[PDB]
Coordinates of C-alpha atoms in Angstrom, one line a residue:
Chain N
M1 CA 88.4 100.9 80.6
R2 CA 85.3 99.0 79.7
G3 CA 86.8 95.9 81.2
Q4 CA 87.3 97.6 84.5
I5 CA 83.9 99.3 84.3
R6 CA 81.6 96.3 83.8
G7 CA 83.9 94.3 86.1
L8 CA 83.4 97.1 88.7
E9 CA 79.7 97.1 88.6
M10 CA 79.8 93.3 88.8
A11 CA 82.1 93.7 91.8
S12 CA 79.5 96.0 93.4
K13 CA 76.7 93.5 92.9
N14 CA 79.1 90.9 94.4
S15 CA 79.5 93.2 97.4
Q16 CA 75.8 93.7 98.0
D17 CA 75.4 89.9 97.8
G18 CA 78.0 89.6 100.5
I19 CA 76.0 92.1 102.6
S20 CA 72.9 90.0 102.3
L21 CA 74.8 86.9 103.3
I22 CA 75.7 88.9 106.4
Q23 CA 72.1 89.7 106.8
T24 CA 71.2 86.1 107.0
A25 CA 74.0 85.2 109.4
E26 CA 73.2 88.3 111.5
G27 CA 69.5 87.3 111.8
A28 CA 70.5 83.8 113.0
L29 CA 72.8 85.4 115.5
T30 CA 70.1 87.8 116.6
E31 CA 67.9 84.9 117.4
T32 CA 70.7 83.1 119.1
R33 CA 71.2 86.1 121.3
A34 CA 67.5 86.0 122.3
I35 CA 67.9 82.4 123.2
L36 CA 71.0 83.1 125.3
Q37 CA 69.1 85.9 127.0
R38 CA 66.4 83.5 128.1
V39 CA 69.1 81.0 129.2
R40 CA 70.7 83.6 131.4
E41 CA 67.3 84.4 133.0
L42 CA 66.9 80.7 133.8
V43 CA 70.4 80.7 135.3
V44 CA 69.7 83.6 137.6
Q45 CA 66.3 82.1 138.6
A46 CA 68.1 78.7 139.1
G47 CA 70.5 80.6 141.3
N48 CA 67.9 81.6 143.8
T49 CA 66.2 78.3 143.5
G50 CA 69.2 76.6 144.9
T51 CA 67.2 77.3 148.0
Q52 CA 63.6 77.7 146.9
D53 CA 63.0 74.7 144.7
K54 CA 64.3 71.2 144.4
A55 CA 66.4 69.1 141.9
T56 CA 63.1 68.2 140.3
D57 CA 62.4 71.8 139.5
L58 CA 66.0 72.5 138.6
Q59 CA 65.6 69.5 136.3
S60 CA 62.6 71.2 134.7
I61 CA 64.7 74.3 134.2
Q62 CA 67.3 72.0 132.7
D63 CA 64.8 70.6 130.3
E64 CA 64.1 74.1 129.0
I65 CA 67.7 75.0 128.8
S66 CA 68.7 71.8 127.1
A67 CA 66.0 72.5 124.5
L68 CA 67.4 75.9 124.0
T69 CA 70.9 74.5 123.4
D70 CA 69.5 72.1 120.9
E71 CA 68.0 75.1 119.2
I72 CA 71.3 76.8 119.1
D73 CA 72.8 73.9 117.3
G74 CA 69.7 73.9 115.2
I75 CA 70.5 77.5 114.2
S76 CA 74.1 76.8 113.6
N77 CA 73.4 73.9 111.3
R78 CA 70.1 74.8 109.6
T79 CA 71.3 78.4 108.9
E80 CA 72.1 78.4 105.2
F81 CA 72.4 81.2 102.6
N82 CA 71.9 79.4 99.2
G83 CA 73.0 76.3 101.1
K84 CA 76.0 77.9 102.8
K85 CA 76.1 76.5 106.3
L86 CA 78.2 79.2 107.9
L87 CA 77.8 79.2 111.7
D88 CA 79.4 75.8 111.8
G89 CA 83.0 75.6 112.9
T90 CA 84.1 75.1 109.2
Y91 CA 84.9 78.9 109.1
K92 CA 86.6 79.2 112.5
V93 CA 88.4 82.5 112.9
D94 CA 91.9 81.2 113.5
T95 CA 92.6 77.5 113.6
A96 CA 95.9 76.3 115.1
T97 CA 96.8 75.6 111.4
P98 CA 96.1 78.7 109.3
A99 CA 95.8 76.5 106.3
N100 CA 92.5 75.1 107.7
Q101 CA 90.8 78.4 108.5
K102 CA 88.7 78.2 105.3
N103 CA 88.6 82.0 105.2
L104 CA 85.9 83.7 103.1
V105 CA 87.0 85.8 100.1
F106 CA 84.4 88.3 98.9
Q107 CA 85.4 89.9 95.6
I108 CA 85.0 93.6 96.1
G109 CA 86.7 95.4 93.1
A110 CA 87.3 94.5 89.5
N111 CA 91.0 93.7 89.7
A112 CA 93.2 91.2 91.4
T113 CA 93.3 91.2 95.2
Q114 CA 90.4 93.7 95.4
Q115 CA 88.8 91.4 98.0
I116 CA 88.5 90.8 101.7
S117 CA 88.4 87.9 104.3
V118 CA 85.6 86.8 106.6
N119 CA 85.2 84.2 109.3
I120 CA 82.5 83.0 111.7
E121 CA 81.8 80.5 114.4
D122 CA 78.9 79.8 116.8
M123 CA 77.3 76.5 117.8
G124 CA 76.4 74.6 121.0
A125 CA 80.1 74.6 122.0
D126 CA 80.5 78.4 121.8
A127 CA 81.1 79.1 125.5
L128 CA 84.4 80.5 126.7
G129 CA 87.1 79.8 124.2
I130 CA 90.7 79.5 125.2
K131 CA 92.0 77.7 122.0
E132 CA 89.5 74.9 122.4
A133 CA 86.5 75.8 124.4
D134 CA 87.8 73.9 127.6
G135 CA 87.1 70.5 129.1
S136 CA 84.6 70.1 132.0
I137 CA 84.0 73.8 131.7
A138 CA 83.4 76.4 129.0
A139 CA 81.7 73.9 126.7
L140 CA 78.8 72.5 128.6
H141 CA 77.8 75.9 129.9
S142 CA 76.4 76.6 126.5
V143 CA 75.7 73.0 125.7
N144 CA 74.7 71.2 129.0
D145 CA 73.9 73.5 131.9
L146 CA 74.9 72.6 135.4
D147 CA 71.3 73.4 136.4
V148 CA 70.5 69.7 137.0
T149 CA 71.0 69.6 140.8
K150 CA 74.6 70.9 141.1
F151 CA 73.5 74.3 142.4
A152 CA 71.8 72.5 145.2
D153 CA 75.2 70.9 145.9
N154 CA 77.3 74.0 146.5
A155 CA 77.4 77.8 146.0
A156 CA 79.9 79.6 143.8
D157 CA 83.0 78.3 145.6
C158 CA 83.9 75.5 143.2
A159 CA 84.2 77.1 139.7
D160 CA 83.0 73.8 138.1
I161 CA 79.7 73.5 140.0
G162 CA 79.8 77.1 141.2
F163 CA 77.1 79.6 140.3
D164 CA 79.4 82.5 139.6
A165 CA 81.4 80.4 137.1
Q166 CA 78.2 79.3 135.4
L167 CA 76.9 82.9 135.0
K168 CA 80.3 84.1 133.9
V169 CA 80.7 81.6 131.1
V170 CA 77.1 82.2 129.8
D171 CA 77.9 85.9 129.8
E172 CA 81.1 85.2 127.9
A173 CA 79.3 83.2 125.2
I174 CA 77.0 86.2 125.0
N175 CA 80.0 88.4 124.5
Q176 CA 81.3 86.1 121.7
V177 CA 78.0 86.3 119.9
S178 CA 77.7 90.0 120.5
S179 CA 81.3 90.4 119.3
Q180 CA 80.6 88.4 116.2
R181 CA 77.4 90.4 115.3
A182 CA 79.3 93.6 116.0
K183 CA 82.1 92.7 113.6
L184 CA 79.6 91.8 111.0
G185 CA 77.9 95.1 111.3
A186 CA 81.2 96.8 110.9
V187 CA 81.9 94.6 107.8
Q188 CA 78.7 95.5 106.1
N189 CA 79.4 99.2 106.8
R190 CA 82.7 98.7 105.1
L191 CA 81.0 97.0 102.2
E192 CA 78.5 99.8 101.7
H193 CA 81.2 102.4 101.9
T194 CA 83.0 100.6 99.2
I195 CA 79.9 100.2 97.1
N196 CA 79.6 104.0 97.1
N197 CA 83.1 104.2 95.8
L198 CA 82.6 101.5 93.2
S199 CA 79.5 103.1 91.8
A200 CA 81.2 106.5 91.8
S201 CA 84.3 105.2 90.1
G202 CA 82.0 103.4 87.6
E203 CA 80.4 106.7 86.7
Chain V
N1 CA 67.5 88.3 102.3
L2 CA 67.3 85.6 99.7
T3 CA 64.4 87.6 98.1
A4 CA 66.8 90.6 97.9
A5 CA 69.5 88.5 96.1
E6 CA 66.9 86.9 93.8
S7 CA 65.7 90.3 92.8
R8 CA 69.2 91.7 92.3
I9 CA 69.7 88.9 89.8
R10 CA 66.2 88.8 88.4
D11 CA 64.6 92.3 88.9
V12 CA 65.8 94.9 86.5
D13 CA 66.4 98.4 87.7
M14 CA 63.7 99.9 85.5
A15 CA 65.1 103.4 85.9
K16 CA 68.4 102.6 84.2
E17 CA 66.6 100.3 81.8
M18 CA 64.2 103.1 80.9
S19 CA 67.2 105.3 80.1
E20 CA 68.6 102.5 77.9
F21 CA 65.3 102.3 76.2
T22 CA 65.3 106.0 75.5
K23 CA 68.8 105.8 74.2
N24 CA 68.3 102.8 71.9
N25 CA 65.3 104.4 70.4
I26 CA 66.9 107.7 69.7
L27 CA 69.8 105.9 68.2
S28 CA 67.4 104.1 65.9
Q29 CA 65.7 107.4 64.9
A30 CA 69.0 109.0 64.2
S31 CA 70.2 106.0 62.3
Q32 CA 67.2 106.2 60.1
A33 CA 67.8 109.9 59.5
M34 CA 71.3 108.8 58.4
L35 CA 69.8 106.4 56.0
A36 CA 67.6 109.2 54.6
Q37 CA 70.7 111.2 54.0
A38 CA 72.7 108.2 52.7
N39 CA 70.3 107.4 49.9
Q40 CA 70.3 110.9 48.4
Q41 CA 73.8 110.8 47.0
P42 CA 72.8 108.7 44.0
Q43 CA 70.3 111.2 42.8
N44 CA 73.0 113.8 42.4
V45 CA 74.9 111.1 40.5
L46 CA 71.9 111.2 38.3
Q47 CA 72.2 114.9 38.0
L48 CA 75.6 114.3 36.6
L49 CA 74.0 111.9 34.1
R50 CA 71.0 114.0 33.3
Chain L
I1 CA 76.9 112.5 73.4
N2 CA 74.2 109.9 73.8
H3 CA 75.9 106.5 73.6
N4 CA 76.5 107.0 77.3
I5 CA 74.6 109.9 78.9
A6 CA 76.2 111.7 81.9
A7 CA 73.0 111.5 84.0
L8 CA 74.2 108.7 86.3
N9 CA 74.9 110.8 89.3
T10 CA 71.1 111.2 88.9
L11 CA 70.5 107.5 89.2
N12 CA 73.1 106.9 91.9
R13 CA 71.7 109.7 94.1
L14 CA 68.3 108.1 93.4
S15 CA 69.3 104.7 94.6
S16 CA 70.9 106.4 97.6
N17 CA 67.7 108.3 98.5
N18 CA 65.6 105.1 98.0
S19 CA 68.1 103.2 100.1
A20 CA 67.7 105.8 102.9
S21 CA 63.9 105.7 102.7
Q22 CA 64.1 101.9 103.0
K23 CA 66.3 102.1 106.1
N24 CA 63.9 104.7 107.5
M25 CA 61.0 102.3 107.3
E26 CA 63.1 99.5 108.7
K27 CA 63.6 101.7 111.7
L28 CA 60.1 103.0 112.0
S29 CA 58.2 99.8 111.5
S30 CA 60.3 98.1 114.1
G31 CA 60.8 101.2 116.3
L32 CA 64.6 100.9 116.5
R33 CA 67.8 102.6 115.4
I34 CA 69.7 99.3 115.9
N35 CA 67.4 97.1 113.8
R36 CA 70.6 95.9 112.1
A37 CA 74.2 95.6 113.4
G38 CA 75.5 97.9 110.6
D39 CA 73.3 100.7 112.0
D40 CA 75.4 100.8 115.2
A41 CA 77.7 97.9 115.9
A42 CA 79.3 99.4 119.0
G43 CA 76.0 100.5 120.5
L44 CA 74.6 97.1 119.6
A45 CA 77.1 95.2 121.7
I46 CA 76.7 97.7 124.6
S47 CA 72.9 97.4 124.4
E48 CA 73.3 93.7 124.5
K49 CA 75.2 93.7 127.7
Chain F
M1 CA 98.6 126.3 63.2
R2 CA 96.9 122.9 62.6
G3 CA 99.5 121.2 64.7
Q4 CA 98.7 123.4 67.6
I5 CA 94.9 123.2 67.0
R6 CA 94.5 119.5 67.0
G7 CA 97.1 119.3 69.7
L8 CA 95.1 121.8 71.7
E9 CA 91.8 119.9 71.5
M10 CA 93.7 116.7 72.4
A11 CA 95.1 118.7 75.4
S12 CA 91.6 119.6 76.4
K13 CA 90.5 116.0 76.3
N14 CA 93.5 115.2 78.4
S15 CA 92.5 117.8 80.9
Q16 CA 88.9 116.5 81.2
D17 CA 90.4 113.1 81.7
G18 CA 92.5 114.5 84.5
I19 CA 89.3 115.9 86.0
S20 CA 87.6 112.6 86.1
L21 CA 90.6 111.0 87.7
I22 CA 90.2 113.6 90.4
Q23 CA 86.5 112.6 90.6
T24 CA 87.4 109.1 91.4
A25 CA 90.0 110.1 94.0
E26 CA 87.6 112.6 95.4
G27 CA 84.9 110.0 95.8
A28 CA 87.3 107.7 97.6
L29 CA 88.2 110.5 100.0
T30 CA 84.6 111.5 100.5
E31 CA 83.9 108.0 101.7
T32 CA 87.1 108.1 103.8
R33 CA 85.7 111.2 105.4
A34 CA 82.5 109.5 106.3
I35 CA 84.5 106.7 107.9
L36 CA 86.6 109.2 109.9
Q37 CA 83.4 110.9 111.0
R38 CA 82.1 107.6 112.4
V39 CA 85.4 107.0 114.1
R40 CA 85.3 110.4 115.8
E41 CA 81.9 109.6 117.1
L42 CA 83.2 106.4 118.5
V43 CA 86.1 108.3 120.1
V44 CA 83.7 110.7 121.9
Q45 CA 81.4 108.0 123.0
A46 CA 84.5 106.1 124.2
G47 CA 85.5 109.2 126.1
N48 CA 82.4 109.1 128.3
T49 CA 82.5 105.3 128.5
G50 CA 85.8 105.6 130.3
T51 CA 83.3 105.7 133.2
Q52 CA 80.1 104.1 131.9
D53 CA 81.3 100.9 130.3
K54 CA 84.2 98.5 130.7
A55 CA 87.2 97.4 128.7
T56 CA 85.0 94.7 127.2
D57 CA 82.7 97.4 125.7
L58 CA 85.6 99.6 124.8
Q59 CA 87.0 96.5 123.1
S60 CA 83.8 96.2 121.1
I61 CA 84.2 99.8 120.1
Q62 CA 87.8 99.0 119.1
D63 CA 86.5 96.1 117.0
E64 CA 84.3 98.6 115.0
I65 CA 87.1 101.1 114.8
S66 CA 89.7 98.6 113.7
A67 CA 87.3 97.4 111.0
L68 CA 87.0 101.0 109.9
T69 CA 90.8 101.4 109.7
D70 CA 91.0 98.2 107.6
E71 CA 88.4 99.9 105.3
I72 CA 90.6 103.0 105.0
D73 CA 93.5 100.9 103.9
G74 CA 91.0 99.1 101.6
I75 CA 90.1 102.4 100.0
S76 CA 93.7 103.5 99.7
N77 CA 94.7 100.3 97.9
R78 CA 91.5 99.2 96.0
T79 CA 91.0 102.7 94.7
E80 CA 92.2 102.7 91.1
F81 CA 91.4 104.8 88.0
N82 CA 92.2 102.5 85.0
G83 CA 94.4 100.6 87.4
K84 CA 96.0 103.7 88.9
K85 CA 96.3 103.1 92.6
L86 CA 96.7 106.7 93.8
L87 CA 95.9 107.1 97.5
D88 CA 98.9 104.9 98.3
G89 CA 102.1 106.7 99.4
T90 CA 103.7 106.3 96.0
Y91 CA 102.6 109.9 95.2
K92 CA 103.5 111.5 98.5
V93 CA 103.5 115.2 98.3
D94 CA 107.1 115.9 99.3
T95 CA 109.5 113.1 100.1
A96 CA 112.7 113.9 101.9
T97 CA 114.3 113.2 98.5
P98 CA 112.5 115.3 95.8
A99 CA 113.5 112.7 93.2
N100 CA 111.2 110.1 94.8
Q101 CA 108.1 112.3 94.9
Chain S
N1 CA 67.4 103.6 134.4
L2 CA 69.0 100.8 132.4
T3 CA 65.8 100.7 130.4
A4 CA 66.3 104.4 129.6
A5 CA 69.8 103.8 128.4
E6 CA 68.8 100.7 126.5
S7 CA 66.1 102.7 124.7
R8 CA 68.5 105.6 124.0
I9 CA 70.7 103.2 122.1
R10 CA 67.9 101.0 120.7
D11 CA 64.8 103.1 120.5
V12 CA 64.7 105.5 117.5
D13 CA 63.2 108.9 118.0
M14 CA 60.5 108.3 115.4
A15 CA 59.7 112.0 115.2
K16 CA 63.1 112.9 113.8
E17 CA 63.2 109.6 111.9
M18 CA 59.9 110.5 110.3
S19 CA 61.3 113.8 109.2
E20 CA 64.2 111.9 107.7
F21 CA 61.8 109.6 105.9
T22 CA 59.9 112.6 104.5
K23 CA 63.2 114.1 103.4
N24 CA 64.7 111.1 101.7
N25 CA 61.4 110.5 99.8
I26 CA 61.2 114.0 98.4
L27 CA 64.8 113.8 97.5
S28 CA 64.0 110.6 95.6
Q29 CA 61.0 112.2 93.8
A30 CA 63.1 115.3 92.9
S31 CA 65.9 113.1 91.7
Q32 CA 63.5 111.3 89.4
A33 CA 62.2 114.5 88.0
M34 CA 65.8 115.4 87.3
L35 CA 66.2 112.2 85.4
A36 CA 63.0 113.0 83.4
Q37 CA 64.7 116.3 82.5
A38 CA 68.1 114.7 82.0
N39 CA 66.9 112.3 79.3
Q40 CA 65.3 114.9 77.1
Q41 CA 68.5 116.6 75.9
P42 CA 69.2 113.7 73.3
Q43 CA 65.9 114.3 71.5
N44 CA 66.8 117.8 70.7
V45 CA 70.1 116.3 69.5
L46 CA 67.8 114.3 67.2
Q47 CA 66.2 117.6 66.1
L48 CA 69.6 118.7 65.0
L49 CA 69.9 115.4 63.0
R50 CA 66.3 115.4 61.7
Chain K
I1 CA 83.9 129.6 53.7
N2 CA 82.7 126.0 54.4
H3 CA 85.8 123.9 54.9
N4 CA 85.7 125.3 58.5
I5 CA 82.5 127.0 59.4
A6 CA 82.7 129.8 62.0
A7 CA 79.8 128.4 64.1
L8 CA 81.9 126.9 66.9
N9 CA 81.1 129.5 69.5
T10 CA 77.7 127.9 68.9
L11 CA 78.9 124.5 69.9
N12 CA 81.1 125.7 72.7
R13 CA 78.2 127.7 74.3
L14 CA 76.1 124.6 73.8
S15 CA 78.5 122.3 75.6
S16 CA 78.7 125.0 78.3
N17 CA 74.9 125.2 78.8
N18 CA 74.6 121.4 78.8
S19 CA 77.5 121.2 81.3
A20 CA 75.6 123.7 83.5
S21 CA 72.3 121.8 83.3
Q22 CA 74.2 118.6 84.3
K23 CA 75.7 120.3 87.3
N24 CA 72.2 121.7 88.2
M25 CA 70.8 118.1 88.3
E26 CA 73.8 116.9 90.3
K27 CA 72.9 119.5 92.9
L28 CA 69.2 119.0 92.8
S29 CA 69.1 115.2 92.8
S30 CA 71.4 115.2 95.8
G31 CA 70.2 118.4 97.4
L32 CA 73.6 120.0 97.7
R33 CA 75.7 122.9 96.4
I34 CA 78.9 121.1 97.6
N35 CA 78.2 117.7 95.9
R36 CA 81.7 118.0 94.5
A37 CA 84.8 119.7 95.9
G38 CA 85.2 121.9 92.9
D39 CA 81.8 123.5 93.6
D40 CA 83.2 125.0 96.8
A41 CA 86.6 123.7 98.1
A42 CA 86.8 126.2 101.0
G43 CA 83.3 125.8 102.1
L44 CA 83.7 122.1 101.8
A45 CA 86.6 122.1 104.2
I46 CA 84.7 124.4 106.6
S47 CA 81.6 122.2 106.4
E48 CA 83.7 119.2 107.2
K49 CA 84.9 120.7 110.4
Chain Q
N1 CA 72.7 126.4 114.9
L2 CA 75.6 124.5 113.5
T3 CA 73.1 122.5 111.5
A4 CA 71.9 125.8 110.0
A5 CA 75.4 126.9 109.0
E6 CA 76.2 123.4 107.7
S7 CA 73.1 123.6 105.5
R8 CA 73.8 127.1 104.3
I9 CA 77.2 125.8 103.0
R10 CA 75.9 122.4 101.9
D11 CA 72.2 122.6 101.2
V12 CA 71.4 124.2 97.9
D13 CA 68.4 126.5 97.7
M14 CA 66.6 124.3 95.2
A15 CA 64.2 127.0 94.2
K16 CA 66.9 129.2 92.8
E17 CA 68.8 126.2 91.5
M18 CA 65.6 125.0 89.7
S19 CA 65.4 128.4 88.0
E20 CA 69.1 128.0 87.0
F21 CA 68.2 124.6 85.6
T22 CA 65.4 126.0 83.6
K23 CA 67.6 128.8 82.3
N24 CA 70.6 126.6 81.3
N25 CA 68.3 124.2 79.5
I26 CA 66.5 126.9 77.4
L27 CA 69.9 128.4 76.6
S28 CA 70.9 125.0 75.3
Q29 CA 67.8 124.6 73.2
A30 CA 68.2 128.1 71.8
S31 CA 71.9 127.4 71.1
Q32 CA 70.9 124.4 69.1
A33 CA 68.4 126.3 67.2
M34 CA 71.2 128.8 66.4
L35 CA 73.2 125.8 65.1
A36 CA 70.4 124.8 62.9
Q37 CA 70.4 128.3 61.5
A38 CA 74.2 128.5 61.3
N39 CA 74.6 125.4 59.2
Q40 CA 72.1 126.6 56.5
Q41 CA 74.3 129.3 55.0
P42 CA 76.6 126.8 53.1
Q43 CA 73.6 125.5 51.1
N44 CA 72.9 128.8 49.6
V45 CA 76.6 129.0 48.8
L46 CA 75.8 125.8 46.9
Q47 CA 73.0 127.6 45.2
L48 CA 75.6 130.0 44.0
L49 CA 77.6 127.1 42.6
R50 CA 74.6 125.2 41.3
Chain T
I1 CA 63.1 97.4 91.1
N2 CA 59.4 96.4 91.4
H3 CA 59.3 92.7 90.5
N4 CA 60.2 92.2 94.2
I5 CA 60.0 95.2 96.4
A6 CA 62.3 95.4 99.4
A7 CA 59.5 96.4 101.8
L8 CA 59.3 93.0 103.5
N9 CA 61.0 93.9 106.7
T10 CA 57.9 96.1 106.8
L11 CA 55.6 93.1 106.6
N12 CA 57.6 90.9 108.9
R13 CA 57.8 93.6 111.6
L14 CA 54.0 94.0 111.1
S15 CA 53.3 90.3 111.6
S16 CA 55.6 90.5 114.6
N17 CA 53.8 93.4 116.2
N18 CA 50.4 91.8 115.5
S19 CA 51.6 88.6 117.0
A20 CA 52.7 90.4 120.1
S21 CA 49.4 92.2 120.4
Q22 CA 47.6 88.8 120.1
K23 CA 49.7 87.4 122.9
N24 CA 49.0 90.5 125.0
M25 CA 45.3 89.8 124.7
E26 CA 45.8 86.2 125.4
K27 CA 47.4 87.2 128.7
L28 CA 44.9 90.0 129.6
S29 CA 41.7 88.2 128.8
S30 CA 42.9 85.3 130.9
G31 CA 44.9 87.3 133.4
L32 CA 48.0 85.2 133.1
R33 CA 51.6 85.3 131.9
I34 CA 51.7 81.5 131.7
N35 CA 48.5 81.1 129.6
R36 CA 50.7 78.9 127.3
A37 CA 53.7 76.7 128.1
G38 CA 55.8 78.6 125.6
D39 CA 55.4 81.8 127.6
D40 CA 57.3 80.2 130.5
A41 CA 58.0 76.4 130.6
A42 CA 60.1 76.4 133.7
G43 CA 57.9 78.6 135.7
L44 CA 54.9 76.6 134.4
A45 CA 56.4 73.4 135.9
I46 CA 57.2 75.2 139.1
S47 CA 53.8 76.7 139.3
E48 CA 52.3 73.3 138.8
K49 CA 54.1 71.9 141.8

């Protein structure tokens, strides 16, 4: 009994610790979401300034956007909880090889297998993900915007220099971040629920 | 967040720890009372001698 | 009956009430009910969009 | 007499122990009930967002719900009183075969 | 209109949330008082020993 | 008359009173009369619904 | 309205329940005093032996 | 629970609100939303031109 009791309280501590890890990652992704919001604003504004302003001004917009990218990588790589750099692709959700997923095992209960799995990925190349991001598309859209001159070259009828494609893929990156944050919120709800059961059982 | 984890390791929950303080004291007081009872047997041994 | 008192539902409900009050402030100081993705994950995603 | 006396007090201890087992299971089911409450909320909200929001957003709601499911299984399988995993279907109320209840 | 919906998801109704704050606090204070009553039984146990 | 004193109604009523006081705190610290399904099973189910 | 009914099932009237808490405690204290009186008869039995 | 209180989301949201109010005045006293290049870098460059 005692074994499982003290082990159970320790498991609850472990769970709260997992929650706070999620708090750090969640804050990083919150800020990432603010960045991507600003990016989308610049994409829309770039969209009209395919008429209004020149490749010089579009290049200024690109300066800002590229800086914002560099910050996204900066979040992905500086973000550490007790040194744990998470947002990097080390903890990809599902590699081609399941052996290389590097899944995250939080211990949750006192006994064997009373644990879970967690994964995460966001970085510069977090645009639309097929299995890789893609080649000329779905990677730069987060990393290197097309907002250099290429909107002055053509409207949305190209899909590689088209405005619609651009805006779409940005919105999809947003949907991946939003999805990740949503999952994490669910997970910490799960954890808290469990911690209630752990403390109860402990009593 | 790190502050929270730090505290969970470092900061004691002084409610529970107060209860443990209470408990350990009363166990000490009780224990002493048990000594005061323990050390009275020999004097009735003396009553057998006296 | 005192090696392990039974008044731990007391402490657990206490940590729960204090947890709640904390969350309350986290909402009020910020002015949000979605200050954290565990408050409302679904509505968070929606609100994002 | 003595036989039945000490046996009787032991039986009462045994009964209290059974109660506390029930306390554990009851707490697990309390939490399960909170989960299911949240689920129902998401179902209602999903109901109106058959108009308001898209299959992407419904998919986000599904992400949360699926997580909550996974927690229900997590309760059913992590829940143990001295190792006794109860909520699992091992102790089904009434199998087709009464021998396997 | 979208601002309204955003707020209904995001913005808390701080009136109700204030009332919940009030409530949770007083439940905490009450709970602590119940601890202060809980931890006084053992000392009358001592009175049985002493 | 002392191998087994008759003052066990004393102790049983004592454990009963202490049990009651425990339950009282369990209600007061939480603020519920249904903190546990044995308090009121029927009303629990209803309240659920 | 449903909140009201919910509370009437769920929410305890902590005034009355406080009074019940008071009562149960004092019954415990009294009971213990009755034990302290109960367990003093045997020692006058000893006075008959001694 | 008091060696390190958990009421730091309080202070962080406070410094954030005060930061915002500062920025608000910086805009209002000047009468600009581009008083500083971090407000809007892109629109700053454009506005320059």
